[PDB]
Design a protein around this nucleic acid. Structure first.
Ligand SMILES: [Cl-]
Ligand SMILES: [Cl-]
Ligand code: NA
Ligand code: NA
Lengths: 214, 208
DNA sequence: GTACGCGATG
DNA sequence: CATCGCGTAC
């Protein structure tokens, strides 16, 4: 179709046109996502679900709709999209460096410990490190990189349980494990300067107009 | 806060009955994956209800500038906080008062919380009958006073993977069916509407 | 009944 | 160190 771009993830990350489009436009697209996922200028966690659409759409752009399977139930653990049948986890995180990234959105103490004792990395990860007005990047972290680090340090150092007596939102990858998987030689990245654009937008207008018309 | 006006104005009621299902269907279409609806649909439904308030009562009288992580309060109407909640089913069940699963913090909530704010509860029942309910703070408080915190508030069940502290189904039934609660009946009829979530973004990648 | 998605911000 | 939003479906 007319919106097609003229180890598949390796190919994506080395494609010069993809690199240029991501560097030039990912900030703008992510800014539209946040403008649609906020209230009083504060961004909701649900922005992640919209950013995920944007990243899956990059895959469709390069590889074609026939080769990207987006039809995964929204509550599926980990896997967000498949590329030529191969599962991909997408994660997004804002900060000077990524911190506190979740592996599962479970807070119950018993279920969290069950996860710690059973989970290991299985899926290729696309991690977007957002750092507004500064430098971040998008990272392709192969399943085997995650497995290497997990094998080396063990579950008890890789996985951080929710802290009891606080109000958290899930089981996290440890900050040390995250930094190690992001910086492995076999991890690929596109660096991004997250420059903001003067784009505005009132979330309520569409709906007020639908109430008012006719 | 004049919310009773919305529930007594025949003309606005008619627009709500004719248009709420369509708008809520769009919200679901934009909050799904593989045709399964995400919890975040509630945040978009809330925007639709706040917009109804803006239309009925005026921009000047509806404050929407509340942080997205504010507990309970979603909007203010003539200065008065309003909680908006949405729920799908044959009857409303398992509705959250706070999105805390931690056992200790959930207990603390149980021990300290009481109803304070007017509630707009939207009961969605696709292809059947539901409604929009205005449940005044005083109705919630009266039921809470009669049955007590331990019958009104349901703690997250330990050893399961839930999402928060709930109003009990007993309490929800009582506040919904109270004589002083007002409602607009809604026939939740689906409309033929085509939409693809990814198209916008694929097209922007191509244009970019 | 019980499974589960999405991180930003004090 | 910590705080909090949003229910569906299975
Ligand atoms: Cl991960
Ligand atoms: Cl309530
Ligand atoms: Na994800
Ligand atoms: Na709400």
């Amino acid at each position: 179709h007319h919106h097609h771009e003229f180890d598949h993830l390796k190919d994506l990350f080395r494609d010069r046109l993809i690199i240029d489009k991501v560097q030039r436009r990912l900030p703008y697209m992510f800014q539209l996502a946040e403008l649609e996922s906020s209230r009083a200028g504060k961004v909701g966690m649900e922005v992640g679900s919209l950013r995920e659409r944007i990243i899956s759409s990059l895959l469709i752009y390069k590889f074609g709709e026939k080769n990207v399977e987006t039809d995964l139930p929204i509550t599926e653990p980990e896997i967000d999209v498949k590329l030529f049948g191969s599962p991909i986890s997408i994660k997004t995180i804002t900060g000077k460096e990524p911190a506190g990234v979740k592996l599962i959105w479970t807070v119950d103490a018993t279920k969290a410990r069950q996860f710690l004792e059973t989970w290991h990395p299985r899926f290729d990860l696309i991690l977007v490190h957002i750092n507004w007005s500064s430098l971040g990047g998008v990272y392709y972290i192969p399943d085997y990189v995650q497995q290497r680090i997990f094998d080396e340090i063990g579950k008890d150092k890789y996985i951080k349980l929710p802290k009891q007596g606080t109000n958290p939102r899930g089981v996290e990858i440890s900050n040390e494990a995250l930094k190690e998987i992001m910086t492995d030689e076999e991890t690929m990245s596109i660096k991004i300067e997250w420059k903001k654009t003067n784009v505005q937008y009132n979330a309520f207008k569409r709906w007020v107009d639908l109430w008012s018309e006719g």
